[PDB]
Ligand binder design. Structure first.
Ligand SMILES: [Mg+2]
Lengths: 412, 131, 295, 56
DNA sequence: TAATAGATTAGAGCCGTTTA
RNA sequence: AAACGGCUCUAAUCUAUUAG
């Protein structure tokens, strides 16, 4: 009481899977080789012993292969054995193969048209061996069969996996943040962002982690200023939120710290032999062509060529303190004509970025980000931020690492 | 080494109470929940637009292949999946032949006059916008 | 630019489910670039294209493609710049086990230029409308009201929410922010992080990979490295794991597309779409409220 | 050059002859000539039906 | 009113079709 | 506008501060 389906497996796999799953859904015992995870002896036993119908799929590749031809041959021998004219039901599905050029062994049989509207062909099959007395519908069986073999090859497994992120932790902060009472030594119309060290104008004070005498070369009036006027604030209480006073709130102090981090890292790239390009909200920092050995750091490419243009991997940094003291570097691709001069038009840059990121995936993105960050690093496992003459911000070379108990088998 | 939790994939129901994660595979395997009998397709657009829609609706009937059939499943064919008839020979056609407002008004009033005056019922109007 | 939204809006008064298809979509091969391959190369996705179009046409014709698998009304609400307009989209399970996903309409207007929040009156009106819809569909008030949005909720609008909800009903406020810069890679494989992984930061805030590599599809729902969505329970009391489960479930009901799942909860996306439809044209009194007229 | 397989009742289903026939068809496919394998049917009881697929 | 940040938010385009 | 994503761009607002 089995319905044997013979076909060319690679060409007709999709059709055979669909038809077999449907037929199992309606409640018909179905035998196909792609429904089972020697074998040919089992095929012979099923064909000769307890199959009722023998469906043969008749694509342009389902009539020239030896295996399908010989299962059709044993099928016709069994057909002559049972003395039942209703054994071999062709299923023509290919438009390129007409009702000619079809094998002698199957040319005389009344085929079922799957050329258009597979649903009509399935309905013809159903009302064919419904009144042909071929032996309850249970679609749960079809769902199970779909899960066991078509699905089990790839699924979620209880496998431990480890992940690199965008988040690079801040190893250590300068202990004390200093506000300087710079009434007249600091001009009111002067921009504090161009100061040799990062500086914010907060409450007429000059927010910085730097000492009161760093701002001397371009701010010479600041000398002979009393250090008692400066207010020094424990950075640990800022990070933990313990410091919340009427003078300054914890969240706005943390905002000043984040501004300090971003500005200091900006000046660090200013001295890091790395070029900058303007995005909408941040700056992207990338290496020019020829500034790395064989266009590589370690063994990871950061600058390359495509279709007469050049791409440079670039990073845009911005710190945050909510989960922990840690910045989040962002990965960009910056395009050029000759590798040293930028393309002014932004639409061409966008199109080139979408072209290049098409073939980039997890491994390439992670390797390029890690290579860039380890390239800018001075310390072996840390990067320096010049926020003070004696104070610095330490950024971990290795980003925040994560691990999960569930993962997948990598297909490659 | 922060813990990354896993949330189990939620299963979307299909016909006959069979739950599958992928809407495409669940639709091809079991089908939609409710059985609408067919789509009385109505098309407003140019004659070239009508021809394009009719050709594509002819192509929909036959199964069509992605370039990568495992990463993205095949389309068995509209009647194979949904169990309802949407042929292209049963189309209610409305021929057409500040700019945004009047351009929208053309298709709009075509659709409203067809839904108001015309006897033939349309279940969904396929506005074939030219390019 | 605004052909689709205006066309869908002007048909709202006389409810007509419509699907806009471009000639460059149905027949993409005919339109080259005068130099070579067509503008919209759909060769690799032709089957997928057919899938999606067929699903859309079946949904707009009153067909229900796939359900979801109680007592919780998921209210994804999104603001659109015009004055700002808040448009909602609700989804819940009835006593008939048939998921009801229509979308709350009649956008509530906050005149403030950049305040993406509701005034108390508009908030009360929205929550009353949602609760009454749930009551009429389910003959009882919801056990939980899962309000989520792309924004955070201020204390006065959430106070209006809590004043207007009835007793023994708990409402939870969730913010789902996209493109928060956490590009979390995989150092071992060459493929991105598998979809469904969640980095729980605190009891109220976390990252979720609603999109990415899926073993079942043997590839990614998204190119490059997936961008996790930040889920913050800024209002209400709810388990972070349960909220992540609910968000992953809501990422399934994109009836506008035949795709495995989308990166954001679909309530927010459909609320966004109906918001574009509403704000495209003049005011509509009691708009259709069913998605087939918007998506 | 050629592979004559005895096709009696016992000689068409035994494991060893089956494996020899299988490798014979493999080398036939490699040689790309259909004039390789020759069944010699000797057994009265064994008809031309019930014979092995690989030689049917 | 103007500015300088950081945080939230929102709108638009624009390219690719998810490494087999 | 089949669609979902990745990016790119722009603007607004809330805070805190400084100059009107
Ligand atoms: Mg659509």
């Amino acid at each position: 009481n089995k319905i044997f389906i013979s076909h060319a497996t690679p060409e007709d796999d999709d059709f055979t899977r669909w038809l077999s799953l449907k037929l199992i859904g309606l409640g018909y015992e179905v035998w196909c080789d792609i429904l089972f995870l020697d074998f040919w002896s089992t095929i012979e036993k099923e064909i000769r012993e307890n199959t009722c119908k023998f469906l043969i799929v008749s694509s342009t590749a389902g009539n020239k292969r030896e295996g399908v031809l010989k299962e059709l041959a044993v099928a016709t021998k069994v057909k002559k054995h049972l003395q039942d004219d209703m054994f071999i039901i062709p299923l023509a599905i290919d438009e390129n193969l007409s009702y000619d050029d079809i094998n002698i062994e199957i040319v005389r049989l009344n085929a079922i048209d799957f050329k258009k509207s597979w649903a009509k062909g399935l309905q013809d099959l159903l009302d064919a061996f419904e009144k042909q007395n071929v032996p309850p519908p249970d679609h749960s069986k079809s769902n199970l069969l779909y899960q066991q073999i078509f699905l089990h090859d790839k699924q979620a497994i209880e496998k431990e996996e480890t992940y690199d992120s965008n988040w690079f932790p801040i190893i250590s902060f300068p202990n004390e943040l200093r506000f300087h009472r710079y009434d007249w030594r600091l001009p009111k119309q002067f921009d504090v962002r161009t100061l040799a060290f990062p500086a914010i104008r907060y409450k007429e004070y000059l927010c910085t982690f730097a000492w009161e005498y760093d701002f001397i070369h371009q701010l010479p009036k600041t000398e002979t200023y009393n250090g008692q006027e400066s207010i020094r604030i424990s950075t640990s209480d800022i990070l933990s939120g313990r410091y919340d006073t009427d003078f300054i709130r914890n969240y706005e102090c943390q905002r000043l710290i984040v501004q300090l981090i971003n500005k200091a890292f900006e000046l660090r790239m200013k001295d890091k032999n790395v070029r900058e390009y303007q995005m909408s909200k941040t700056f992207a920092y990338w290496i020019e062509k020829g500034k790395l050995e064989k266009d590589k750091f370690e063994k990871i490419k950061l600058v390359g060529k495509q279709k007469n243009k050049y791409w440079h991997f670039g990073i845009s940094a911005a710190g945050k303190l909510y989960p922990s003291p840690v910045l989040m570097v962002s990965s960009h691709i910056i395009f050029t004509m000759d590798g040293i001069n930028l393309i002014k038009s932004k639409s061409i840059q966008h199109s080139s970025r979408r072209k290049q990121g098409k073939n980039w995936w997890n491994d390439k993105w992670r390797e390029k980000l890690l290579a860039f960050i380890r390239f800018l690093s001075d310390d072996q496992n840390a990067i320096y931020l010049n926020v003070g003459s004696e104070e610095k911000i330490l950024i971990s070379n290795k980003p925040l690492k994560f691990f999960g108990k569930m993962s997948y088998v990598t297909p490659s | 080494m922060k813990e990354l939790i896993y949330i189990e994939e939620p299963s979307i129901l299909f016909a006959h109470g069979q739950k599958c994660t992928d809407p495409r595979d669940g639709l091809a395997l079991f089908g939609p929940l409710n059985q609408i009998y067919g789509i009385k397709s109505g098309v407003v657009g140019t004659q070239k637009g009508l021809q394009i829609f009719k050709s594509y609706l002819d192509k929909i009937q036959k199964p069509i292949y992605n370039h990568n059939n495992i990463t993205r499943p095949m389309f068995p064919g509209f009647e194979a999946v949904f169990g309802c008839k949407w042929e292209s020979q049963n189309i209610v056609f409305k021929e057409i032949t500040k700019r945004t407002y009047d351009l929208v008004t053309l298709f709009n009033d075509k659709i409203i006059t067809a839904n108001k005056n015309d006897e033939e019922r349309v279940d969904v109007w396929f506005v074939i916008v030219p390019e | 630019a605004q052909f689709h939204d205006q066309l869908k809006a002007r048909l709202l008064e006389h409810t007509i489910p419509t699907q806009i298809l471009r000639e460059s979509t149905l027949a993409w091969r005919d339109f080259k670039n005068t130099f070579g391959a067509p503008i919209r190369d759909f060769s690799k996705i032709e089957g997928h294209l057919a899938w999606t179009i067929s699903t859309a046409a079946y949904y707009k014709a009153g067909g229900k493609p796939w359900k979801l698998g109680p007592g919780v009304c998921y209210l994804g609400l999104v603001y659109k710049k015009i004055q700002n307009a808040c448009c909602a989209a609700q989804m819940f399970l009835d006593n008939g086990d048939g998921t009801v996903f229509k979308g709350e309409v009649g956008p509530w207007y906050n005149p403030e230029k950049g305040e993406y929040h509701l005034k108390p009156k508009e908030a009360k009106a929205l929550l009353t409308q949602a609760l009454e819809s749930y009551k009429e569909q389910n003959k009882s008030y919801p056990k939980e009201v899962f309000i989520h949005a792309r924004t955070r909720f201020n204390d006065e609008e959430w106070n209006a929410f809590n004043e207007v909800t009835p007793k023994n009903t708990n409402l939870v406020g969730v913010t789902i922010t996209k493109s928060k810069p956490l590009k979390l890679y995989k150092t071992e494989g060459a493929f991105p992080i598998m979809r469904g992984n969640a980095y729980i930061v605190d009891e109220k805030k976390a990252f979720l990979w609603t999109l990415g590599f899926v073993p079942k599809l043997q590839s990614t729902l998204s190119m490059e490295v997936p961008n996790p969505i930040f889920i913050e329970i800024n209002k209400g009391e709810a388990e972070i794991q349960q909220v992540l489960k609910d968000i992953l479930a809501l990422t399934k009901l994109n009836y506008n597309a035949c795709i495995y799942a989308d990166g954001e909860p679909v309530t927010l996306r459909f609320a966004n779409k109906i918001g574009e439809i509403l704000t495209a044209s003049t005011e509509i009194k009691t708009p259709p409220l069913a998605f087939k007229y918007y998506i």
